[PDB]
């Protein structure tokens, strides 16, 4: 039996123990789960616009207090009067103020220029910080759609434009949507599609830190897997400079003399900070970069203090101690407190006593006391987060910063203990045995005192491997404007010329996985850091040298077209096989599928030249029975590579023998099945090697339809000026002889068989005999457009009869791709060794609908991995949504800090009928609709508003949409439907519909 009462109750014990070991790590991850700070964003006083720019303002001791802003239209004259009690005057003669908060990029988001004018400068600087903190983390900001991601923004209600009661001249419906902190967290979750809790925090000088507390909580509860915490205090008005002066609290110099005897007020500054918070387990499991770790944050109130504004000591001690208790740490653990340091000779005394009580009472080493407001100024709701960026930069650089204007230690504070040393000099603060911890404090004017604990990120990042690879991963970048496209290559060139030695695959991985796909794409496959910074120096000016550039809005899914004959060179795929493992494996698989039916192994054939066969008295790839299997093999291998690099087909087009590849890659037939088909076919297609042959020519279809005769009739329609005719030697030579003198050239391809005619049925006996019923038709994986019927048909229609029928009637390749554009798909990849008929589909798109994008894999005499990298580059630049977690699935690539989006900022500040003549009418209504659009869009420059951009990405929300439809219902005098903005998403579509509604 079971060894009574010794192998069960000991077996039940290990589970009442291990479940307990699992039900306690749940409490410890529900309450003391150390959350990581994934990325940093900051727009701080001075020139600070990025977290790395804040360090050389903080490490070399630069004060950001310069002067009051002049961009904002401030009075600046009634702000200063000798009488200190005059209503309307401010006491501080400066302060650290943002020089870029006045400007914004409206067209970047789904925001109208008028709406962005109505947007609070806080809410317009917060969206950019959100985009930066997402692009800094290697997380595509457009990849977080309908995902749990909380937004926690600390804010200060600030007066902006005219009274809501008085409305405005253009800002009538959007003025609330700016001057409400409500949408100051919802707008960010709306533009980025974040689904997690969009919460705005308002506790004044502690808001952001209080905010991060909430975000921390939302991580330690699991409500949101990710959070974007922080706070902003951007001042569009001098109002509280006038009002803080009435209580006599502003420093006349505007400088936060934290813990100094020369302090004469708490100063003021405007700024903004944002933290990307994720729990450590999720941060490391997902691979998100962990800068530092918020371990424990506490939020408390001052209680019944000496007024609402005066701080409280016991409450501050209580919140600082509660942060340590909730973080599981003690006073000694914190190596460098960075407390509020308001700047006044009243708040600093009280708060230093609280620091000495919570920390200095039991200290082993002198606590390094600092204050970010000394370098920046009191940023209010941006204070509490700004100190967090300080410390995180301190631990990512291993140095404790200075506290400016702190040489004269305050005489009202007892520093005789020595447990607190004010950071007046840069103290080396290196990584060691002790986990490097510290603590940020923020005590708001509302009385809410809050404290967060920041530990250094556990140094487990070390251990990465090193290697080298021949894969030239594309350096892909994208922006919302052409100028931004030229600015995202200049800033990247600046970063790779000022931060040299960063390995190219790391840069490609960070640019590819970490940057959103925006509708102006530049992509190039670099070979060196000198051939890349040269392309980045030509892309900054607009010259497309060694790169691919494309505007590809509303384009996400690609079509795989399969050309037939045309690359008689066939000296390409040797390099691809020799350099690409996938082409060295898929080719082997399809060859070993071809070998049981056609003994020719494509491997000896591969390693050779284009003139190899010519030396053995044989034309370049002319033997049908030997050639058709090799195009099929190279073709299916190229398609397998394209699907292995993340590009999956949407539709499939097979010109002549691309139907076999449609069978194979789309899942309709297996590798063996489709190989068997082309093998058995090649032998019953090489049985007609007499006078037969085709002659591709740009001769017009409506005239060759009269030229049909002498056995030479159309076999394929590859475009408007592209016709493949097939016949015997009756009209063969005379076609060239009688056409070449009239600027029309007959491209007589070196072929010996005719297809898509009445001659294939001469082998109908053998074609139905030497094909067999074994490649049973199966519903595959990709939709396919038949080139025998010219229609989108089932994936299960595919037998020997289908192969006969395809080689029987006209291909109608032009019709197939016209229906392609019609079904919603706009991009096609010419998988082949050389892209014959590349301009044919550009001709198709030129004379019908919109222009199509001709992506090709490789060219004639171009088969190295550099050319395939250029293929991926031109695919991305032309709108193809490449998967960059597959190109960089493994190459020894790691995330690297890169410059964020270059927001093309423009100053947006709010201060307190045609009788059917011709298609000239089409373009006249077009211009009319555009002008009424860029007058309800607040585009003061009516000049242009992108034609390919939707009515939901130019900020055409209700107000804009409704007034637009009313303007059109008056100018054109029509009855546009109520949901017209949804019926016609584009100004192109709207104009076409309106000019089509003439009767």
């Amino acid at each position, epitope marked *: *039996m*079971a*060894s009574t009462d*010794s*192998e*069960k*109750v000991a*077996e*039940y014990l*290990r*589970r*009442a123990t*291990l*479940d307990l070991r*699992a*039900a306690r790590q749940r409490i410890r991850e529900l309450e003391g789960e150390p959350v990581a700070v994934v990325a940093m964003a900051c727009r701080l006083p001075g020139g600070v616009s990025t977290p790395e720019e804040f360090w050389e303002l903080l490490s070399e001791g630069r004060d950001a207090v310069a002067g009051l802003p002049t961009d904002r239209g401030w009075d600046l004259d009634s702000l200063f009067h000798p009488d200190p009690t005059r209503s309307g005057t401010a006491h501080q003669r400066g302060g650290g103020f943002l020089t870029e908060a006045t400007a914004f990029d409206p067209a970047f988001f789904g925001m109208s220029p008028r709406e962005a004018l109505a947007v609070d400068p806080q809410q317009r600087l917060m969206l950019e910080l959100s985009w930066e903190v997402l692009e800094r983390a290697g997380i595509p900001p457009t990849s977080l759609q309908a995902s749990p991601t909380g937004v926690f923004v600390g804010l200060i209600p600030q007066e902006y434009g005219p009274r809501l009661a008085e409305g405005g001249e253009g800002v009538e419906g959007y003025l609330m949507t700016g001057t409400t902190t409500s949408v100051a967290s919802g707008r960010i979750a709306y533009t980025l599609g974040l689904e997690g809790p969009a919460i705005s925090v308002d506790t004044a000088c502690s808001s952001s830190l209080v905010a991060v507390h909430l975000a921390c909580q939302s991580l330690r509860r699991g409500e949101s897997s990710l959070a974007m915490a922080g706070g902003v205090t951007v001042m569009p008005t001098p109002g509280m400079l006038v009002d803080f002066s009435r209580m006599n609290s502003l420093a006349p110099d505007g400088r936060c003399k934290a813990f100094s005897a020369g302090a004469n007020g708490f100063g003021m500054a405007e700024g903004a900070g944002m933290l990307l918070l994720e729990r450590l387990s999720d941060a490391r499991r997902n691979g998100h970069p962990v800068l530092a770790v918020l371990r424990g944050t506490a939020v408390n109130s001052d209680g019944a203090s000496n007024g609402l504004s005066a701080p409280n000591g016991r409450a501050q001690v209580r919140v600082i101690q509660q942060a340590l208790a909730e973080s599981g740490l003690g006073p000694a653990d914190i190596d460098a407190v960075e407390a509020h340091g308001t700047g006044t000779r009243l708040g600093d005394p009280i708060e230093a006593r609280a620091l000495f009580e919570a920390y200095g009472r039991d200290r082993e080493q002198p606590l390094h006391l600092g204050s970010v407001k000394s370098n920046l100024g009191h940023t209010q709701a941006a204070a509490g987060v700004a100190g967090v960026i300080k410390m995180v930069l301190a631990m990512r650089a291993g140095t404790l910063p200075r506290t400016l204007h702190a040489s004269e230690r305050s005489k009202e504070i007892d520093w005789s203990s020595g447990a607190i040393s004010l950071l007046d000099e840069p103290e080396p603060w290196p990584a060691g045995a002790r986990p490097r911890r510290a603590g940020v404090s923020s005590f708001g004017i509302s009385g809410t005192n809050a404290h967060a604990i920041i530990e250094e990120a556990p140094q487990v990042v070390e251990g990465e491997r090193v290697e080298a690879g021949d894969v030239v991963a594309p350096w892909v970048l994208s922006a919302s404007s052409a100028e931004g496209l030229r600015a995202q290559a200049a800033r990247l060139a600046a970063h790779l010329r000022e931060h040299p030695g960063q390995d190219p695959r790391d840069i490609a991985y960070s640019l590819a996985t970490g940057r959103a796909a925006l509708p102006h794409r530049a992509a190039f496959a670099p070979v060196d850091e000198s051939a890349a910074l040269r392309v980045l120096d030509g892309l900054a000016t607009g010259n497309a040298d060694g790169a691919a550039v494309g505007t590809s809005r509303a384009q996400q899914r690609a079509v795989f077209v399969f050309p037939g004959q045309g690359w008689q060179w066939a000296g390409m795929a040797v390099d691809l096989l020799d350099t690409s493992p996938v082409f060295a494996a898929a080719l082997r698989e399809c060859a070993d599928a071809l070998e049981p039916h056609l003994d020719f192994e494509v491997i000896p054939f591969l390693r050779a030249e284009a003139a190899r066969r010519e030396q053995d008295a044989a034309l370049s790839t002319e033997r049908v029975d030997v050639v058709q299997p090799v195009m099929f093999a190279v073709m299916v291998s190229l398609a397998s590579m394209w699907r292995a690099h993340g590009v999956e087909p949407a539709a499939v087009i097979g010109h002549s023998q691309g139907e076999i590849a449609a069978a194979c890659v789309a899942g309709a037939l297996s590798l063996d099945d489709a190989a068997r088909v082309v093998a058995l076919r090649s032998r019953v297609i090489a049985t007609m090697p007499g006078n037969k042959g085709m002659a591709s020519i740009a001769a017009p279809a409506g005239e060759v339809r009269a030229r049909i005769g002498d056995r030479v009739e159309i076999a394929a329609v590859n475009g408007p000026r592209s016709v493949v005719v097939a016949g015997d030697s009756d009209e063969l030579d005379r076609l060239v002889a009688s056409c070449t003198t009239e600027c029309i050239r007959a491209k007589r391809l070196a072929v010996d068989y005719a297809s898509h005619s009445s001659h294939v049925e001469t082998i109908r006996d053998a074609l139905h005999a030497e094909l067999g019923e074994d490649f049973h038709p199966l519903p595959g994986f990709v939709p396919f457009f038949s080139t025998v019927t010219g229609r989108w048909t089932q994936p299960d229609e595919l037998d020997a009869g289908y192969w006969y029928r395809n080689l029987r009637r006209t291909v109608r390749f032009a019709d197939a791709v016209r229906a392609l554009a019609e079904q919603g798909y706009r991009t096609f990849l010419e998988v082949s060794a050389h892209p014959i008929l590349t301009a044919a589909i550009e001709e198709i798109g030129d004379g019908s609908g919109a222009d199509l994008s001709a992506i090709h894999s490789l060219r004639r005499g171009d088969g190295s991995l550099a050319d395939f990298g250029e293929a991926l580059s031109r695919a991305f630049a032309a709108g193809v949504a490449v998967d960059w977690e597959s190109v960089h699935l493994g190459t020894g690539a790691r995330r690297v800090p890169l410059p964020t989006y270059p927001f093309q900022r423009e100053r947006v500040w709010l201060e307190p009928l045609a009788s059917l003549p011709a298609p000239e009418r089409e373009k006249a209504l077009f211009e009319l609709v555009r002008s009424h659009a860029a007058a309800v869009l607040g585009h003061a420059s009516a000049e242009r508003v992108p034609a390919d951009q939707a009515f939901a990405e130019l900020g055409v929300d209700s107000l804009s949409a409704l007034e637009l439809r009313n303007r059109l219902g008056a100018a054109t005098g029509v009855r546009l439907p109520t949901t017209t903005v949804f019926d016609h998403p584009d100004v192109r579509t709207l104009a076409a519909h309106l000019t089509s509604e003439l009767g």
Partner: antibody
Amino acid sequence: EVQLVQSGGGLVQPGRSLRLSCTASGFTFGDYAMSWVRQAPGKGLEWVGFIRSKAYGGTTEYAASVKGRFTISRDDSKSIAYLQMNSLKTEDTAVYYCTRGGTLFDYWGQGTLVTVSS
Amino acid sequence: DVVMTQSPLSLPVTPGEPASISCRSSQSLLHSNGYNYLDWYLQKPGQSPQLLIYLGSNRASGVPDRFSGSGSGTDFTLKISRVEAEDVGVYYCMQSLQTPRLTFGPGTKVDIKR
């Protein structure tokens, strides 16, 4: 985490030998008692056998039907448990399960479909 | 002898409903320890079984709270406070008094109720 990854499928005829290997990852293998449970098609579980923990003697206990033939062994150094199936009769056509306890079958592993047909 | 057990083999459940599956044992599974020695197990349709409850009432780690166990020495009851698609399958009543364990019993065939 913990996994009880299995292997040992294939083709056997009445009167042959087979091996069922269970690899445990996540905890110490020596103090858990391995068990093999079988899934007859159409019904739930039936327990095949169980070996004691290494320090609990490591003695075995199977069902009377599979006594002896279905040997149960284990090992910590390479951390592997063997069910050697011997003379699989046609009643051994079943899904076998590696259980993580003599009386407390915790993880159940994945499940190997062993077929015994002529 | 052996503690041969019975259960409601064909107990139906419907979404949004609390269900009460039971087991009845011939002998007393309450050991001198004072702890009931019964185990509740769940087999998913075409998947590996899982250990829901041990010692009569307590959870296994990773098993949702929606299962609760109780009962006396002979009668045992598991209530599912809220049934879902993951709470469908076969429920096994396992005695830990005598182990040889020849079979797992008939098992409770749980189905979504219409």
